[PDB]
Amino acid sequence: MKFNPFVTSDRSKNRKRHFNAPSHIRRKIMSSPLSKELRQKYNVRSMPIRKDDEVQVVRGHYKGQQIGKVVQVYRKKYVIYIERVQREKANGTTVHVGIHPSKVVITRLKLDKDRKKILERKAKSRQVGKEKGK
Template identity: 60%
Template sequence: TDVSSSASKCRKSHFATTSTQRRELMASPLSKELRQKYNVRSLPIRKGDEVMVIRGSNHDYEGVVTRVHRKKFVINVERITRKKTNGESVPIGIHPSNVVITKLKLNRDRRELLARKNRSTKKGKYTNADAADLD
């Protein structure tokens, strides 16, 4: 299908996405160490991942993701809270693009996703023999 260049249509499609599409939109980049290890640039964020905030007023905070709020496009990180006027502490929502994943919560599905996204397996698909055949 064709993608519209109309700003209002793009906004509408972005905010009217399904929960499964929002999961992919709410992906965060991996830290340099994890990028070296898995050859993957980013992954959809999930509860239990350890992240470091790199943008905004809470930058340089580290913590575990306590909630992924797909409806609001935000995540909550432990210890990043603010006080309400009645003294109650509430978590601050952070967009996943403003954090870097420093430690992954791995399960079988996530390992399979990492193996599928591994960019080094796609490198060098042509051998010298294949190149000679092209000549």
């Protein structure tokens, strides 16, 4: 259960919170898991997906073991566009098909300074909890 008497557990409230979410908050919502490989290395479950990570689509039609680079992040549409994840429209023009970030797995991160410091913060909290549990 949730016991904190200031959170909500109220369909209408959670959905309204979700759909009318502000960009910086959507960043967090649009997170996606690391590959087991990276999960081992960084000590982090998942990361906020970003403009030019390398990525697999895990479920759907485009479900496949190819590793496409991310193309853009349409936070309004809760979606990311990926390199070869696309479909030919009526008149031949390719159109980047949206995939939801959570149905995707990050194989290669785009590491900047800030992304580096984020991963350092998440790994540290994870190991504090393991120390507290032990």
